[PDB]
């Protein structure tokens, strides 16, 4: 367990976790889902909660966060699920992530960057020279480290 | 890091739990 892969954790769970204050409630979940144009009702919230809730407080705390990563996540994701993934990046739905619908989504999700760090994502993903990322690039920058 | 790689995960988490 390296101190990056723990710095990555803490940074997926602070995009969850707004107020800062160390559980994730069902208010703070159902923020980030709705930011990803999802509807969950509380009582769907609550459930997804409950499958991790080790503790039986209500709320998830950092490991149960783990825990929940672990399981739903590589559950072993398909075409059309990689593909809803790709339709939250690409906003308009032209096909192409600009940097600017990149900048915009990551925002949306809480995390806060400069233009100069979204530019140099694109460049990374961005195989055939285009400035943008398609699908086929989208799906391939996932492979690599 | 893994910028791109750490958000499709938060991406691809929520799309799973609203199963
Ligand atoms: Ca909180
Ligand atoms: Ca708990
Ligand atoms: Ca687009
Ligand atoms: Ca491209």
Redesign the pocket.
């Known amino acids: 367990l390296t101190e990056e892969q723990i710095a990555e954790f803490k940074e997926a769970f602070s995009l969850?976790?707004?107020?800062?204050?160390?559980?994730?409630?069902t208010?703070?979940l159902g923020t980030v889902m709705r930011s990803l144009g999802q509807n969950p009702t509380e009582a769907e919230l609550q459930d997804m909660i409950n499958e991790v809730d080790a503790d039986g407080n209500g709320?998830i705390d950092f490991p149960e966060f783990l825990t929940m990563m672990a399981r739903k996540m590589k559950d072993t994701d398909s075409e059309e699920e990689i593909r809803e993934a790709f339709r939250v990046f690409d906003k308009d739905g032209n096909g192409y992530i600009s940097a600017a619908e990149l900048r915009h989504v990551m925002t949306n999700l809480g995390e806060k960057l400069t233009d100069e760090e979204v530019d140099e994502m694109i460049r990374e993903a961005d195989i055939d020279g285009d400035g943008q990322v398609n699908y086929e690039e989208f799906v391939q920058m996932m492979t690599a480290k | 890091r893994r910028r791109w790689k750490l958000d499709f995960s938060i991406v691809s988490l929520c799309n799973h739990l609203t199963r």
Request: net charge negative; aromatic share 8%.
């Open positions: 969850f976790d707004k107020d800062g204050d160390g559980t994730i409630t208010k703070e709320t």
